Amino acid sequence: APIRVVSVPESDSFMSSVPDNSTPLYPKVVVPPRQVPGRFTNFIDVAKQTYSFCSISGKPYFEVTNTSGDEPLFQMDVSLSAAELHGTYVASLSSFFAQYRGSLNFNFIFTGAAATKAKFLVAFVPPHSAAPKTRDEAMACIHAVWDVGLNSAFSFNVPYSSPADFMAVYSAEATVVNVSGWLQVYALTALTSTDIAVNSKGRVLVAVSAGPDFSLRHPVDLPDKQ
Amino acid sequence: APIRVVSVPESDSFMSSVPDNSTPLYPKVVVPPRQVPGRFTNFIDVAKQTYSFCSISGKPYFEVTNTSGDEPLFQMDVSLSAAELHGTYVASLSSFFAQYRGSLNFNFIFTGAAATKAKFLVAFVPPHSAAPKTRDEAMACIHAVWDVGLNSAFSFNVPYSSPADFMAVYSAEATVVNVSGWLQVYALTALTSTDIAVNSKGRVLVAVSAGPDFSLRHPVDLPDKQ
Amino acid sequence: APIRVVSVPESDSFMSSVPDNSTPLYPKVVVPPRQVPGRFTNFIDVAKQTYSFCSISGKPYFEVTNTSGDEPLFQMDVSLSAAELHGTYVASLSSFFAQYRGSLNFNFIFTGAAATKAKFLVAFVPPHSAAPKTRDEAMACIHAVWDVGLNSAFSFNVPYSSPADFMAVYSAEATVVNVSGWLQVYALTALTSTDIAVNSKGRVLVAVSAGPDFSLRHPVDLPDKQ
Amino acid sequence: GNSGSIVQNFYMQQYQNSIDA
Amino acid sequence: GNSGSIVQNFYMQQYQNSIDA
Amino acid sequence: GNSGSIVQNFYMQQYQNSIDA
Amino acid sequence: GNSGSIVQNFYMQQYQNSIDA
Amino acid sequence: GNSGSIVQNFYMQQYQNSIDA
Amino acid sequence: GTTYCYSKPDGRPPSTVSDPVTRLGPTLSRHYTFKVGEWPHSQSHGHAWICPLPSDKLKKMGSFHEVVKAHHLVKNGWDVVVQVNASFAHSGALCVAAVPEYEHTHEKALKWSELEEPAYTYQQLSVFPHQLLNLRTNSSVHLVMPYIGPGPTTNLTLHNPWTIVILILSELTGPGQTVPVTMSVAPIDAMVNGPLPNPE
Amino acid sequence: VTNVGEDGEPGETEPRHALSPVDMHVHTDVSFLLDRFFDVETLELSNLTGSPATHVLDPFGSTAQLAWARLLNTCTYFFSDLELSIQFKFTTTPSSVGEGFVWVKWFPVGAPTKTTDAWQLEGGGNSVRIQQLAVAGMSPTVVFKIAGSRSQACGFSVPYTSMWRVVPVFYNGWGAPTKEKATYNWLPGAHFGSILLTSDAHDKGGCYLRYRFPRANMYCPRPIPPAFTRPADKTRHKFPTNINKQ
């Protein structure tokens, strides 16, 4: 009658994430009904239905002035480890995982006065020797022309382009699964105003959301701070 | 054929309340029929179908005399740890548990002679800076007017009012789940009698029962006496 | 309630090839679709649908010259441990196993110029005192006449002939399950050419494939190199 | 009251406990 | 989420966890 | 290939291995 | 008499005991 | 001959023994 | 546009009070109008006006105030409209959010004040029910919030579930004058419990 | 404006074809993430004798640079059950302990807590005394020996015992009528109860407490704090990793 059993070598070990529960010692507790609004079941949903502001030089926006042209106003490399993605929800949620997949949605909100106007060219530049320095260079790439004064807000989707099905959350010296290129914003025209003495500059807030195809996998433990 | 088995780390431990039985060593004992009246299966039922007398200054009652008015005759804070709930069944049963929910039913029985009469105002005062000192103050609260000589007994329900679904059995320095307020009884009129030399005072017995919605959860072990 | 169990003596041991899996600690990972061409599921299929070249004196072929006759041009004993089977896929795959069964298919490809011609006699000689030295001797055995200039390529099947159902992959001093005989190729006629000064010799490439009835069993670990 | 394993009846009801008449 | 044994219900649903009202 | 116990599925197919899409 | 486990027949009736003819 | 446990087939017939052709 | 915070309000009475609950009708819990403060050019991004509801302004909520004042517990939502008075030459933008259990406040508890939010907070305040108030497009934010809390009701003297955070994302530029921030608050589906003693 | 691609008109954006699923968002699931053992806390054993204090199981307001700490701070209200793993690691010579029983007692939210040694065991002259509240009874007592133990641990599941329908991870108000800086983000009973580890070892070693949160429910998302510093403008953080260029 006693059952012949063979003890596996990994026997008395711990294994932290076993797919099984411990023995219960305090049964039959019926818990009170928890009505309460706003329950969420998956972090990816709040990442997709919500936006955070980027950290451009410590502020949540870049500026256009009545003197601008050529040079890029905003530039960030496409990696969740990028600096301008620092204080964001999507970037911060990501540190819990090893890999990501999908697009990021950026939306720019021009907060310059109603008496103010400017036009922007926003480009997604794929991995390359070295990042364009002027807009005539970048305009060969995927880009959109944002004329404020048509819509004060503009959404741009940074796509996912890679031979790998997922890329790394934690970047490092450039690898083929580390970085996906750059996102740049140029001034197609400098800020014009009704009176340059009253309005000389206007600020574009830049916010990020997880794209519809965005996903995160492989939960990871936090490494030494840096 | 021997079954691969992995020994959990909590292996040879004790765990006192496991939801399982030990191995039987003395089988097949048929026990004699136990007729016997008065079996009870749940302590809450005997707490609800039964009343005990409170301990007001060591006696099971408070007194009204021909000189009374203003001041409260009986005052107890709504907590199972209250003093006047001391010798009661409900209070004593409670010490076996950590939390309670529901109302308490108090019934006052006037035992003054038939030639005697008085009127009482009984109030349930919610948590507040400091407890009313006179009845004109308390009468702003939930209260009932008991005219003896209409009914010699009067039942009053102390309600459950709290943002928490359960409150603590074991009170301590006032917390939001410790105390629920005060129960007070005032004399609306002093005792009147047919002859003040024969009957100068009358005693109101005060008894407690668990209310219909009363409940107790979380069995707990007895701490050091105090 | 606790189940009576008896621990087998081989209890806490390792046993490397147990037919069972270990406990999973990192669940729910859905893996990306792996399209990719050319998946193979059994090594025997690639051994049968593919050919390798033999190693005759370090070259993948034997030569016929305008001076040949009698003597064997190619001779190899039928054993996967044979030298001329050295660099082949079938021989190399075999070292992973202890036993084999079935036939080997050899195909000779004459690469001498179109202006060149010769005839070969290929024989399968069963185990014997000592291997024939001339073709008139071997021609008593199973043989085929290959006239180049009829077909430039010729396939010959070395059969499986043995009282045992499988023979050894790893040969040694001759045993009854070690060697199955010899495969020899003779020149029925010497190389003829349109001009002996231009073409004096022609090379026959010899390739091997696993036969249709070929099989390998008993995976084995690699022994000391030799 | 307080027996919640599927294995609480590893031993028959007459072996494990007493039986009322 | 994260309980994948066939034996996860070795103890009844009311003994193993709490129960919502 | 090489899993022959009746208990090879003590843990669900999605916990024990990966799943192809 | 005195065998009350569900596992009393872990071994067949002919292996566990003797058999009457 | 001499295998009488209900658990003699804890491993499949093709894993536990050889198979005749 | 109206933004509902987490869900729409309900008039269900608290599951945890077995004593009479009084439903304050709209004409009793009315509506109150306050000036929150003035947004100046000098104040920088991250600066926020913190307005827990209500607790430092309960005394100015007339009718509602009188009723709430006399009872122990209250369950209720709020309907708030934050506005800004700026010209079409003013540039700037705020983010006005409704935060459940907001805390930072260095125990200046339940007092409307001003603080400097810590970056990851101003960057992510949009994660709570909110609306952006861009000075080139709009002048108002309208948020409606349901009762929320760890239990079915609370004591507003000790707890303010909802607190409105008006935060500067893009600084004020343009004409020199300041932009006054304004706010209307209306208690919604208010339910009151257990009457307190007379104040003698 | 215009919407989709290649004319380059103002407001017009180019075509994007969304990617197909693969992982199914399984890993970002709240209850999946929390149903695993986390090494939160490490704690000292109390001697069998005296008047020890119980340790409250409250993993909520943490600052620890660990994944469970931030994660638990991502919502405003939380509900889950609990599982524990208690281990014991020597800090002296393992041969100091010849028996080493450890009594563990778990207390539901609201349980009374004053204990003093009161239960005497007697044997051949010498005697042993254990706490009033270490004895096996109403609430779970677990007893494991550390000596030859192949794992010097124990473990069990316990339910949500709070009186609140949900635990407020953040609370804008006071948990007591007296408004003391102390009772500020407070609320009594916003936890899992408390434990009492008691043993003749006590010196000789410590514990290791791991929590597992089965049946987790989170309410009202909140901002998630950074974890690392901000790299320089227009750069990327570069971390050591599995992948990395050799």
Side-chain angles (χ1 to χ4, degrees), chain I residues 94-157:
Chain I
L94 297 178
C95 175
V96 1
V99 185
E101 309 309 336
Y102 174 87
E103 55 152 271
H104 174 34
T105 22
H106 341 253
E107 207 216 69
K108 318 168 195 179
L110 323 199
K111 278 188 171 179
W112 287 20
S113 48
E114 265 155 90
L115 331 149
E116 236 71 19
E117 286 308 325
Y120 87 84
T121 303
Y122 66 69
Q123 292 185 244
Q124 304 180 52
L125 194 72
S126 342
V127 115
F128 285 114
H130 72 287
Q131 240 169 49
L132 271 204
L133 211 173
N134 188 353
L135 293 187
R136 78 127 42 191
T137 329
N138 35 99
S139 50
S140 315
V141 165
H142 181 204
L143 301 161
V144 184
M145 53 221 99
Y147 165 79
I148 209 166
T153 193
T154 35
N155 178 355
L156 283 186
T157 294

Side-chain angles (χ1 to χ4, degrees), chain C residues 10-11 39 82 150 174 179 209 213:
Chain C
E10 63 247 46
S11 234
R39 160 163 145 72
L150 222 53
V179 255
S209 268
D213 53 12

Side-chain angles (χ1 to χ4, degrees), chain C residues 205-220:
Chain C
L205 296 171
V206 19
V208 217
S209 268
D213 53 12
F214 196 79
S215 197
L216 257 7
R217 28 120 78 159
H218 301 338
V220 192

Side-chain angles (χ1 to χ4, degrees), chain A residues 19 22 24 27-31 34, chain E residues 4 14-16 18-21:
Chain A
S22 296
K28 301 180 177 185
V29 288
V30 170
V31 135
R34 81 195 92 91
Chain E
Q14 336 104 26
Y15 282 80
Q16 195 76 68
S18 21
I19 326 171
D20 301 326

